Amino acid sequence: AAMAEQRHQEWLRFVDLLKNAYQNDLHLPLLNLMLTPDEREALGTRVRIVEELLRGEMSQRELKNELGAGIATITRGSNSLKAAPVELRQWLEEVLLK
């Protein structure tokens, strides 16, 4: 309670700042300021996890061998993808597989 609203406004403030950074072509330096190298790497790898989960060809073990992501990391990704709204999942199939 209470703090949850505080955190939500703080998160939306970031979302809006980055929204406007993309509009002004400052998104790349903004994301270098706001994220660590390891965090950027994780996000690049999470995209590939989403891609290969949507593609449906690799087992969890095969996805681990390809990406270096452990079984628990892949399971986190699968559970998050199952939780995503349908419209996002359908769009991701289009953007990441074609």
Place this chain on the structure above:
Amino acid sequence: QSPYSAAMAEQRHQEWLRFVDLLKNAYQNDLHLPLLNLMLTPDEREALGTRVRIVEELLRGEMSQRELKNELGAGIATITRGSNSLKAAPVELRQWLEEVLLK
């Protein structure tokens, strides 16, 4: 194997740019909020929200490090990492952040 792989560094960078482009396009069709719930943890989202306030108060230059720690619950190492990163930011970014964050 190379002591330092420039090839792997660039491959990782392309993976990062793929995310950046994915999120750019999600902003254009109002899928950015669900995309960020998919791609980030709650703790990571909270950290990003807190980092915005660290930048704001560092640019403002008013609060001490003790005041910033007390206000945000952010250790000295966290405040220092943000100050160091602010030092590496390009002038165009710092000027824009001043315009947007400082009223």
